[PDB]
Amino acid sequence: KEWLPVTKLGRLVKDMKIKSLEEIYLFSLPIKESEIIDFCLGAALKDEVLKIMPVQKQTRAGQRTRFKAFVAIGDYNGHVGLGLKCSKEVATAIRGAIILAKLSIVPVRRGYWGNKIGKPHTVPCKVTGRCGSVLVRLIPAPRGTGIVSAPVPKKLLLMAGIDDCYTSARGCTATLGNFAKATFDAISKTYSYLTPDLWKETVFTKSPYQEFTNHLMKTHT
Amino acid sequence: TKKRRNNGRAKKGRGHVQPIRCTNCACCVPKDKAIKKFVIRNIVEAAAVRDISEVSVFDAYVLPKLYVKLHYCVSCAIHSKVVRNRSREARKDRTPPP
Amino acid sequence: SGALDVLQMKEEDVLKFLAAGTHLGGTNLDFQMEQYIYKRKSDGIYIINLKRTWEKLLLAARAIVAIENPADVSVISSRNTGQRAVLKFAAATGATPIAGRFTPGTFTNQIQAAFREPRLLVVTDPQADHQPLMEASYVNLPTIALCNTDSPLHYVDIAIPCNNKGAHSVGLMWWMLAQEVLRMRGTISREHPWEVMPDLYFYRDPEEIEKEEQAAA
Amino acid sequence: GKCRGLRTARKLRSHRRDQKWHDKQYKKAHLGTALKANPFGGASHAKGIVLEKVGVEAKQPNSAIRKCVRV
Amino acid sequence: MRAKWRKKRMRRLKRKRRKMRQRSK
Amino acid sequence: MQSNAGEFVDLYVPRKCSASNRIIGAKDHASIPMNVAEVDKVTGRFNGQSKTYAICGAIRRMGESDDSILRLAKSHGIVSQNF
Amino acid sequence: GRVRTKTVKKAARVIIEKYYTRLGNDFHTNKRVCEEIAIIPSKKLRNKIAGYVTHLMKRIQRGPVRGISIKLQEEERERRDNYVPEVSALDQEIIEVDPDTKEMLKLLDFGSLSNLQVTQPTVGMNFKTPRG
Amino acid sequence: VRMNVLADALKSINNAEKRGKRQVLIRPCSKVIVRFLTVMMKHGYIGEFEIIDDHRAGKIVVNLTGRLNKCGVISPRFDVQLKDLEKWQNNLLPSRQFGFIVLTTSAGIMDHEEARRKHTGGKILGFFF
RNA sequence: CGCAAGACGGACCAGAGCGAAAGCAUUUGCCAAGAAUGUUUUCAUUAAUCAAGAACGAAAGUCGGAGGUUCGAAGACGAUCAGAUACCGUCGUAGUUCCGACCAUAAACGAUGCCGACCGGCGAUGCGGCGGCGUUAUUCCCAUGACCCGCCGGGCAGCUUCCGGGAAACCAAAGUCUUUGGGUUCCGGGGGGAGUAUGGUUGCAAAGCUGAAACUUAAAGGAAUUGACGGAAGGGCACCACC
């Protein structure tokens, strides 16, 4: 029940030193502890098991069925994650994919169609994402448009907290894994698309490895 | 699927090469394609280099060798165990084996 | 290192480079190392620019001093040569050594025993010590490297151009870097030729260890 | 398209016109042969007179007798 | 049925149609 | 990133490569943030402040990160202009 | 076939690692040490373990062993590694030097040192390994 | 052969910025390339450039930031009414908030946003964002 | 030991060269031709790609000559086999060769149209040019060859890299593509039916070029993974294997 943190970044987050996964996402830190993402977005993170998929390794004495569980996770406020865990039975796969979904979560940059007033509703600009044959293009839309998409990328984009969007999809979208991984990859690239807004050169702040080096020596090894 | 980059053979900028005949079989094989193996070989191995040198009219007469450039049909070669199948990693090794 | 006199290259330091052989490159040249070079020789061997060597040495040492906790600097050698040199460097500077076999997943697998999570790597050879350079690219780790003229600069953020091959050169280069991080930290002064001797860091071939085991009497 | 000339309207139209015939759904509708050989003559429904009641053996897998009517 | 022999069969079948068509001429 | 009222609404402003200006995404684990310490121009000791540099993983995988820190430390005065 | 298994070796490792001070090169005492410091549930295992301990303790009396960790580390690696001669090998009175590194030091502050004997340059560029 | 010189230019500085170059040689030169570049400069996408005068067509050397995501030519130079210019920036720019279609009007080679306030259409040259 | 005839050009012979492709290997001469490099020569947009039209186009095959060594469709046997009009063997006509005339097709393959730009690294090789310590020959210096160490262009390639792409295998092109527009030709549209029928056209013929429909069908197919399997290769074990 109790979390005893193993990694350096996990130690800081439990000891209250860094308090926003925004600050983690700024220095591009690997997030390997599961409870970090369960700590900052915990009372909002909602789960939808997109698909249970029976795969089969043929052996000497008949097929060996394992189950992939594709789980999209996200608050409805600008964070999604897309976890895929393959295990012996579906209970273990779903649980393991929830954990991998958490560990995957990215921030979504969201912007405006035309009139920059109120809160951002749509994708800032046209972003494309790929996986295998699948290509998921996102285009911004005006307010009240909703997500104009298939049931799979709808479940992600809604969880991303993107209220409005026009999608396109090419290639075998029937392969839900690739189709969910493409639309997740497309979303991911919103804070990896250089807009004019981010032309002002960065005032390089201090890593929580550097900022809180003095705490980390006495608290853990 | 394309197994070899150099489609088995060793022509790049030709279009046509003269064929040779595999020695074991006798099948028309392109020269570059064929598994060519040069064999220098004593006319007697070990059992007779003792006996013949003893009955050598001469004193300190070196023996001749037998120089034959063998060509091989790809089937010719693999059945005769001159070349073995190799793993897709070890196919790319072109160094002649030690 | 730059437009400054206190951190300028001194005379006994040049004699320590020229004696070690840190000005002898390989016969080959990496495209990324063409700036850390003066000219070839006859015999084809490329000569390193020892000024540029010293500029990278101080830049490296500057980066090493900028890390507040010293105990999270990983000082890596796998190849025989640097094994001793890095093991002494960590004694001098309070860093953590990895001498010899680097377990894949030390920086990556958080459950392994050797799970050290550093803030900066130092590497005796990018080619030989390629695994930690690759695992630096999975947990954000700046890398310092002791790069020969034919050392691949993939995942190397400061390349110190040296003769990382020869045993004298490596021991010297580590000693220079160990003495400079201490001088910049303020553990030694710059007016005293430092008490620790660069022979202390040299790899000793077990022909020369069994030369010592005999020639005491 | 593989000719982006500004003065290439006819090559692009005349190519598309020629390559529409290699479609099935088009070739079918845009020739008499599909509309002639159609037993209904392009009509939705058709009144006919039963001349025998016919058992047709179902396909390979499943195996019933399908009761059809020769018209 | 190798595709070369399918062609040869169909080629000799076509040759026996310029025999039954060669009688009305 | 700012609304009709002028409010910064995006939930974090990203870092971006000190070499080629490429914004450094939340899951770029190849990306290298370095602190280069500065020195008292007669003593030769760590002052307490540094010239911090940040490279995107992409240029670091290319292997050009070396030359890009070397430029950023030359135009910063840390390194000799002569070189 | 007399190869020892992991449960014998791993035990013997950890026993030496924690209790190097009590052990020696005598089986029948090492056997009796293993009784005291560890619950080995079987006499045969107890001997197998003690037996590999003794074999390792001989290998410890020689040079260092790979998969082991003792207190000292180990008086030839901590103490002897502080070996330093009278004067260093970098203290050459006459440093051999080619004209081309003289040409680069001439384009530094170090135009002329006293202890640099520049050789007559090497003739006939002939260094590459013949192909095939 | 070389036919659209503005294509060679914009593809070469696109290739170069993807590679992360600080500057790029574009080794034929036209007055149309120079007007296009000055438009990309006024909006700060590329850095202050330089036209090398040999006694043939010039060579330009273009300082680059990491702001230019992509520049590109539309070939052929389609004619654009003020009606149609919405449907181009609709399908040819990544948003309404940024990106600029360059189109040669009679007034001069310039962005789509000035072609609105001057109230002059013309031929689409390219685009950049 | 000779003589005669007709094929063929071993070894040298290469991931080497040349050619638009097909193709091209004894010596020597003649004949025109050609890329590449070199150029402070000239013309000055003459260009790129291409319905029509055209040249060349392996082998087999056709017609009329010449020649017929070898090999060898058909055929005659001799074996194997249950059969064996086949694989194996001995003969063997057309053919294989040369000349003139057709034919115009090949997995005619890099299964990858041509032109142009840009984007990595590396050591090789072939051609030309340029530069540089040294060794060797024409010895009597030169200057030319032969090596040696570089650079430049053009070519056939190779290795390597998270450039990037791709379903992948893989590709410095198959990249610079949803961030989709450099120019242009040909050409594909689920599998069969079918490169069939039919009409035209070319051909002495064999056939080639153009070329459907009815009808039938839920797949056919690509790449890769795991397994089983092999009359594939290698390693290992066992007196339920052998010695």
Side-chain angles (χ1 to χ4, degrees), chain C:
Chain C
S1 68
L4 206 63
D5 302 313
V6 185
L7 298 176
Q8 200 59 224
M9 199 186 208
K10 279 195 290 181
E11 179 255 9
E12 79 281 19
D13 305 348
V14 170
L15 294 180
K16 280 178 177 60
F17 289 135
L18 292 168
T22 53
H23 70 284
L24 284 73
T27 308
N28 309 134
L29 183 51
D30 201 79
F31 72 114
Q32 306 279 49
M33 295 290 295
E34 200 181 19
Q35 74 188 341
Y36 308 119
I37 221 159
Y38 180 75
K39 197 186 167 185
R40 300 181 77 192
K41 287 188 283 187
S42 180
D43 201 58
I45 302 163
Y46 289 101
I47 292 167
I48 300 163
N49 185 187
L50 286 170
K51 174 167 186 169
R52 292 174 190 245
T53 306
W54 182 240
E55 293 303 313
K56 302 305 291 185
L57 202 157
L58 295 145
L59 214 171
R62 259 190 172 66
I64 297 155
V65 165
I67 312 307
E68 190 157 17
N69 172 38
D72 54 38
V73 165
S74 199
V75 196
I76 296 160
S77 195
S78 77
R79 189 182 56 209
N80 285 330
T81 303
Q83 285 174 339
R84 187 184 173 183
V86 300
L87 190 50
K88 292 293 181 183
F89 187 102
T93 323
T96 305
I98 302 171
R101 176 64 196 164
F102 179 82
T103 298
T106 50
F107 304 160
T108 327
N109 191 345
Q110 61 267 27
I111 301 163
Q112 277 190 11
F115 177 59
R116 308 304 176 93
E117 190 167 10
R119 285 194 59 205
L120 176 61
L121 257 68
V122 206
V123 159
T124 318
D125 184 25
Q127 203 104 258
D129 320 335
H130 68 93
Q131 184 60 30
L133 283 181
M134 286 285 329
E135 289 200 7
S137 178
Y138 291 107
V139 167
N140 308 91
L141 272 164
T143 57
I144 300 165
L146 284 291
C147 294
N148 208 339
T149 57
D150 43 323
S151 293
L153 289 213
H154 207 305
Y155 294 146
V156 326
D157 303 300
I158 231 66
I160 309 166
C162 326
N163 191 45
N164 65 359
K165 192 177 177 177
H168 294 291
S169 289
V170 170
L172 189 264
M173 284 308 311
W174 282 110
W175 179 79
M176 294 294 279
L177 195 62
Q179 96 156 330
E180 185 51 37
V181 295
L182 288 173
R183 286 177 173 179
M184 284 208 187
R185 177 169 294 174
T187 305
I188 331 159
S189 177
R190 298 181 174 282
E191 301 301 329
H192 300 277
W194 182 34
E195 181 156 17
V196 176
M197 188 155 128
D199 232 77
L200 182 64
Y201 283 36
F202 285 7
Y203 180 62
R204 46 194 301 190
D205 188 57
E207 187 270 325
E208 290 175 312
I209 309 173
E210 283 185 344
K211 188 175 178 183
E212 197 279 321
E213 287 171 22
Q214 181 182 345

Side-chain angles (χ1 to χ4, degrees), chain C residues 40-44, chain G residues 122-127:
Chain C
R40 300 181 77 192
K41 287 188 283 187
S42 180
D43 201 58
Chain G
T122 57
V123 71
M125 290 180 288
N126 192 4
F127 51 94

Side-chain angles (χ1 to χ4, degrees), chain D residues 2-5 8 11 15 19 22 24 27 33-34 37:
Chain D
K2 203 81 174 305
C3 60
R4 301 199 187 84
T8 53
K11 190 59 175 283
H15 174 82
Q19 294 298 326
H22 291 112
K24 288 187 78 167
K27 185 72 162 279
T33 58

Side-chain angles (χ1 to χ4, degrees), chain B:
Chain B
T1 190
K2 189 176 182 185
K3 195 185 187 147
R4 277 56 165 261
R5 240 177 139 306
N6 73 325
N7 296 313
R9 67 209 284 160
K11 90 178 187 56
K12 307 307 296 181
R14 273 94 227 169
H16 189 78
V17 300
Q18 66 274 38
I20 341 165
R21 316 302 296 274
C22 125
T23 60
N24 195 314
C25 65
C27 138
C28 305
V29 176
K31 176 151 183 194
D32 50 1
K33 176 80 158 298
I35 295 88
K36 302 166 287 291
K37 193 175 69 170
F38 193 67
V39 180
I40 78 174
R41 190 173 63 217
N42 289 122
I43 54 90
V44 287
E45 44 179 0
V49 70
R50 188 70 177 78
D51 296 352
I52 292 175
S53 67
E54 229 305 297
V55 299
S56 93
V57 180
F58 304 99
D59 187 35
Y61 172 65
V62 67
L63 292 169
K65 299 170 185 298
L66 195 143
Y67 306 89
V68 167
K69 190 179 173 198
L70 296 173
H71 310 284
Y72 278 116
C73 55
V74 173
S75 31
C76 266
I78 302 160
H79 185 66
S80 187
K81 293 190 173 185
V82 179
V83 305
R84 319 307 180 99
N85 61 293
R86 299 187 287 174
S87 50
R88 295 174 63 267
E89 297 183 345
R91 279 197 212 286
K92 301 185 174 178
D93 287 33
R94 289 184 86 267
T95 57

